[PDB]
RNA sequence: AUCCGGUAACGAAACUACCGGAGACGGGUUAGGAGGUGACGACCUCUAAAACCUAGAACUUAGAGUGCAAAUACGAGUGUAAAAGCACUCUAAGAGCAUUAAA
C-alpha cells in the first residue's frame, strides 16, 4: 500500500480545554518507558552471568512482547502478575514476573515506592505502541553493528600484542572476510551453503550474547590499549535521553484519554441528531466494541467502515476547523502522474510541540487487506563522497564541496549548545551531569558498573526531568528538521549556477585533457539535463532534481589520468605530516600538488567519460 | 568567534600570510538608517537590534507584483521663505515519520 506523512506544528489542533491533558500524558509516557528500559537492560545482563558459554540443551534468551509489558506494570507498582489463566505454556512465564520484580528491588538501594511514578490518568493504552519501537530497535542494532564488533575485538588484540596500528586493520579484514564469507563466530546454521550474512538475518538473538562478551573484555582485558581506540558500543539500547519522546495516538487510544462517561453522552446525542442513528454504547469501555454491535447492522463495504473513524476525530479535535486542515482536505499534488487522492488515516503522532499526520491513498482507504541515449547531449559530472565533506562535485576545471561546517552554520550549532548549557547551569545540575555521571559511563555492560549509574540517576530523576521539560529543547528539535531542507536545497541550487555557464578558463587545470574541455563548454538550462555521478559509499533528495548514475570506486584514489601508473600517496619530504596534504611520488605527473577531494573526484569523472 | 571566494611558492594545507562578502533560534530590553534647514548640527519623530530576561512560532527553494512614514532667491552692508528593512498576494520546482548509532 501507499503511505505518506505530513509534519506540522501542533498549535491549534487540540481544543484549549483538552490541551492540558495531552501535555501531561507525554511526561508520564517518557518516565515509564525510560525507567522500564533500564530495568529490562539490567535483567538481561544478569542472564549473561547465569550461563556462559551457553548450554547445548537450552535456547538463547529472547525477549518477548509481554516482557516489556510486565516491566511497565512493575514500574507503576503492580503487585501481581498480569497473566490470565493457568496452563503448561504459562508455567514458566508466570514465575518470570517474580524474578523481574525481585530485580527491580535489587537495582535500587532503597525501599520501592509506588506513588513516585504512578499517575491518575489511564495512559496504559498509549504505552502499547511505545513498546513496539523499543523491540524493533534491538534487531536493528544487532544486525547492523555486528560486523563492527568483530573487527574491533581483533583490532584491539593486535594493538595489545605490540603489532603496529597500521597493519591491524588489514589483518582484521583478512580474518573478517574468511569467516563472514576463533570464538567470535558460532557454527554455521544454514545447511544450504549460503554466506554467514543469511545466518545473521535468520535470528539476531543468537549473536547478542557474543557481543556482550566482547564489550566486557574490551573494558578490562585490553587495559594497555589507547583510550581513543577503545570506543565502547551499546549492544543493549535504552532510552537515555531525558527529553520527552513522541507518542502515537489512535482512535481507540484517544477515547481512553479524553472521553468520559459524563462527556460521552454529549457525543451520543450529537451523533444521533446529525446522523439519525443511536450508538449502542452504555459505558466508556463499550466504545471499543466490534462494528457489528455498535449499530446493530453491518457495513456494506470496507471503505464504509473507514468513514466512521474520521467522524470520531472531528468531535474531539478540530480536524475540519483548523489551519492544518488545508493540506489534508483531499489535496492532490500537481506532479502526480497517477493523480492519487489522499485523505486522513485516523492516526496522529505528536510530542506536544510538533504533530505528524498520517495520510493514505483514497483507493485503499478503510480496512486495509492483510499486510540511455541522453548521455550524448546531457552534461556529465562526478562525485566523491568523503567523510570531512559530505559531498563533492568536480567538472575537471573547478571543484565545489558541501563541507561539514556549512551544515553546522545553517543548523545554528553554536546557539543550540550555548542555550542548553546556560539553561541547565542555572539550577546547578551541570556539575552532577558532567563531573559525577561521567565517572559511570552508561555504555558499560558489567552489572556492577551499570548498577552504580542506574541508582545515581534515580536519585536526581525528579530534578532532571523538570529541567529538561522546558519546551526550548523540543523547539530546537523541530528547528533542525526545518533547517535541514534549507541547507541541502541551497547547495543544490548553487550546483546549477556553478556549471550553468561554460567555463571561463581552459589552461588553469593543466591535467585537463581534450575530452574534459568538450564537456565543459556544453550549455544547460534545465535541472534534468545534468547527470551527476555517484559512488557506492542524502542521495534520496538529490535524485529528485538531477539524474544519477553509479561508478565503481575501485582504486579511484590512486590512479592518475596522465600517468603510466598509480602515483598518489600522502605528502612526504617535509618535517610536518599535515592532515590531508598529498604530493605525487614521481616527476612524471601533470600536477605535483593534490588534495583528497580533487584527487578522487577527478578519477571518478574520468571513468564515466 | 566561524562559512564562502581570490591572491603564491607546478587546482597546497587547523596557521605560510593577506584581502573581499555572510551570521549568531521566537518575544521584552540596547546602536544604525530616513525625515519639521531630503546644506551639518542645534531639538524631536517611523523602523531595528549583538549583551540580559523569558514555558515559546514556523513545510522548503528560485523568481513576479502590491503596501509602508506623518508633522538658493526676491526685494528698500539687509529680512525670511526617499534608502536599510518588513508584511501580503502569485508563478515554477519539491514535499514519510519515532528512534537506536558511527568510520
Ligand atoms: Zn599522476
Instruction: Report DSSP letters for A531-577, one per residue.
Output: EEEE----HHHHTTTSEEEE---TTTTT--TTSSS--EEE--SSS--
Give me the CA A468–C1' B32 separation in Å, rounded: 38
Cis ω on the peptide bond leading into residue A58 (within 30° of 0)?
Answer: no
CA of A513 to the centre of ligand 1 (A): 13
Strand nucleotide closest to residue A599 (CA to C1'): B11
Dist. CA A543–CA A488, nearest whole Å: 12
A531: nearest Cα among A384, A383, A428: A383
Between CA A574 and CA A478 the distance in angstroms is 48
Give the C-alpha separation, A121 to A254, whole Å. Answer: 13
3-state helix vs strand vs coil in chain A, percent to 5: 50, 10, 40
Any idea which nucleotide's C1' is nearest the CA of A397?
B11
Residues whose CB falls within 8 Å of the CB of residue A601, separated by 6 or more in sequence, listed in order: A382, A383, A384, A392, A393, A394, A399
Q: Write out the E strands in A475-544.
A: 530-534
> How many CB atoms sit inside 10 A of residue A285's CB?
11
Query: Cα(A585) to centroid of ligand 1, in Å?
Result: 8
At residue A364, what are phi and psi to the nearest 5 degrees? -105, 15
CA distance A62 to A205: 6
Separate counts of helices (H) and strands (E) for chain A: 20, 12
In angstroms, the CA of A278 and the C1' of B80 are apart by 90
Q: Give A386 Cα–ligand 1 centroid separation in angstroms.
A: 21
CB atoms within 10 A of CB A489: 12
Distance of CA A240 to the CA centre of its chain: 14
CB–CB of A313/A254 below 8 Å? yes
Nearest DNA or RNA nucleotide to A477 (CA to C1'): B25
- CB A121: neighbour CB atoms within 10 A? 12
CA-to-C1' span, A198 to B45 (A): 78
CA A575 to C1' B19 (Å) is 29
Distance A598 CA to ligand 1 centre (A): 12
Sheet-wide strand order for A3-9? A3-9, A354-361, A342-350, A247-249
What whole-number distance in Å separates Cα of residue A295 and Cα of residue A488?
52
Interatomic distance A270 CA / B39 C1' (Å): 77
Backbone angles phi, psi at A21, to 5 degrees: -60, -40
Q: Which residue has the cell 502526480?
A: A336
Query: Binding site for Zn(2+): which residues of A?
Result: 560, 563, 567, 589
d(C-alpha A576, C-alpha A574), whole Å? 6
Q: How far is the CA of A567 from the centre of ligand 1 (A)?
A: 5
Tell how far CA A326 is from the center of its chain.
Answer: 30
Find the nucleotide nearest A583 (Cα to C1′).
B12
Question: Among all strands, which nt has the closest C1' to A4 (CA)?
Answer: B96
Q: Identify the three-state secondary structure at position A166.
A: coil
Q: Which amino acids of A are annotated as binding site, given as ranges?
A: 560, 563, 567, 589
Stated in angstroms to one decimal place, the resolution of this structure is: 4.7
Closest residue by Cα to the C1' atom of nucleotide B23? A409
Domain spans in chain A, listed from the N-terminal domain onward: 3-12+246-361, 135-220, 375-398+503-608, 413-478
CA distance to A37, A384, A480, per residue, from A349 (Å): 21, 38, 18
A333: nearest nucleotide, CA–C1' criterion: B95
Report the separation in Å between the CA atom of A382 and the middle of ligand 1, taken as the mean of its atom positions: 19
Task: List bases, strand B, within 7 Å of protein CB.
Answer: 2-6, 10-16, 23-25, 53-62, 93-103
Of residues A367, A248, A261, A252, the one with CA closest to residue A312? A252
* Spatial distance from the CA of A5 to the C1' of B75 (Å): 83
CA of A358 to C1' of B56 (A): 26
Task: Fill in the DSSP letter of residue A332.
Answer: -
Amino acid at each position: 500500500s501507499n503511505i505518506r506523512i505530513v509534519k506540522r506544528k501542533a498549535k491549534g489542533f487540540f481544543k484549549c480545554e483538552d490541551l492540558v491533558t495531552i501535555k501531561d500524558a507525554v511526561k508520564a509516557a517518557h518516565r515509564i518507558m525510560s525507567d522500564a528500559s533500564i530495568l529490562v537492560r539490567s535483567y538481561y545482563l544478569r542472564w549473561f552471568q547465569s550461563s556462559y558459554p551457553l548450554d547445548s540443551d537450552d535456547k538463547e534468551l529472547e525477549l518477548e512482547h509481554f516482557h516489556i509489558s510486565m516491566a511497565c506494570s512493575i514500574v507503576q507498582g503492580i503487585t501481581r502478575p498480569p497473566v490470565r489463566g493457568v496452563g503448561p505454556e504459562q508455567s514458566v512465564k508466570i514465575d518470570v514476573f517474580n524474578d523481574m520484580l525481585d530485580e527491580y528491588k535489587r537495582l535500587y538501594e532503597r525501599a520501592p515506592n509506588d506513588k513516585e511514578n504512578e499517575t491518575d490518568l489511564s495512559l496504559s493504552h498509549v504505552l502499547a505502541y511505545s513498546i513496539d519501537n523499543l523491540l524493533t530497535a534491538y534487531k536493528n542494532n544487532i544486525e547492523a553493528h555486528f560486523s563492527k564488533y568483530v573487527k574491533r575485538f581483533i583490532r584491539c588484540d593486535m594493538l595489545a600484542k605490540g603489532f603496529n596500528k597500521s597493519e591491524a586493520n588489514r589483518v582484521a579484514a583478512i580474518y573478517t572476510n574468511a569467516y563472514i564469507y576463533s570464538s567470535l563466530f558460532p557454527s554455521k546454521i544454514n545447511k544450504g551453503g549460503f554466506p554467514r550474512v543469511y545466518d545473521l538475518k535468520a535470528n539476531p538473538w543468537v549473536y547478542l550474547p557474543k557481543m556482550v562478551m566482547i564489550n566486557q573484555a574490551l573494558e578490562t582485558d585490553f587495559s594497555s590499549v589507547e583510550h581513543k581506540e577503545r570506543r565502547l558500543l551499546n549492544p543493549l539500547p535504552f532510552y537515555s535521553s531525558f527529553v520527552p519522546m513522541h507518542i502515537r495516538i489512535d482512535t481507540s487510544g484517544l477515547s481512553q484519554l479524553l472521553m468520559t462517561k459524563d462527556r460521552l453522552d454529549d457525543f451520543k446525542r450529537s451523533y444521533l441528531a446529525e446522523f439519525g442513528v443511536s450508538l449502542n454504547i452504555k459505558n466508556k469501555g463499550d466504545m471499543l466494541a466490534s462494528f457489528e454491535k455498535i449499530f446493530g447492522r453491518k457495513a456494506t463495504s470496507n471503505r464504509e467502515a473507514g468513514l466512521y473513524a474520521t467522524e470520531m476525530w472531528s468531535f474531539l479535535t478540530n480536524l475540519k476547523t483548523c489551519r492544518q486542515w488545508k493540506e489534508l482536505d483531499g489535496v492532490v499534488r500537481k506532479n502526480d502522474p497517477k493523480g492519487t487522492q489522499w485523505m486522513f488515516d485516523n492516526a496522529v503522532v505528536t510530542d506536544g510541540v510538533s504533530i505528524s499526520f498520517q495520510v493514505i491513498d483514497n483507493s485503499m482507504f478503510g480496512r486495509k487487506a492483510f499486510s540511455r541515449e541522453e548521455l550524448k547531449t546531457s552534461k556529465l559530472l562526478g562525485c566523491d563522497p568523503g567523510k570531512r565533506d559530505i559531498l563533492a562535485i568536480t567538472d575537471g576545471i573547478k571543484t565545489i564541496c558541501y563541507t561539514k561546517g556549512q551544515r553546522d552554520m545553517d543548523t545554528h550549532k553554536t546557539i543550540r549548545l550555548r542555550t542548553s548549557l546556560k539553561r541547565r547551569r542555572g539550577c546547578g545540575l551541570e556539575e552532577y551531569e558532567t563531573q559525577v555521571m561521567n565517572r559511570f559511563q552508561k555504555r558499560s555492560c558489567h552489572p556492577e558498573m551499570f548498577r552504580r549509574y542506574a541508582c545515581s540517576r534515580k536519585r536526581m530523576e525528579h530534578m532532571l526531568l523538570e529541567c529538561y521539560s522546558h519546551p526550548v529543547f523540543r523547539e530546537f528539535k523541530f528547528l533542525v528538521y526545518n533547517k535541514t531542507k534549507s541547507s541541502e536545497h541551497r547547495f543544490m541550487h548553487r550546483v546549477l549556477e556553478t556549471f550553468k555557464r561554460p567555463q571561463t578558463n581552459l589552461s588553469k587545470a593543466r591535467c585537463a585533457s581534450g575530452v574534459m574541455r568538450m564537456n565543459a563548454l556544453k550549455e544547460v538550462q534545465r535541472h534534468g539535463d545534468i547527470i551527476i555521478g555517484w559512488g557506492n559509499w542524502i542521495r534520496r533528495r538529490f535524485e529528485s532534481l538531477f539524474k544519477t548514475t553509479t561508478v565503481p570506486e575501485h582504486y579511484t584514489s590512486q590512479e592518475c589520468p596522465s600517468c603510466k601508473g598509480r602515483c598518489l600517496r600522502k605528502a612526504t619530504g617535509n618535517p610536518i605530516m599535515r592532515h590531508h596534504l598529498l604530493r605525487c611520488t614521481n616527476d612524471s605527473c601533470c600536477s605535483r600538488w593534490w588534495n583528497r577531494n580533487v584527487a578522487g573526484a577527478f578519477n571518478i569523472l574520468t571513468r564515466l567519460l
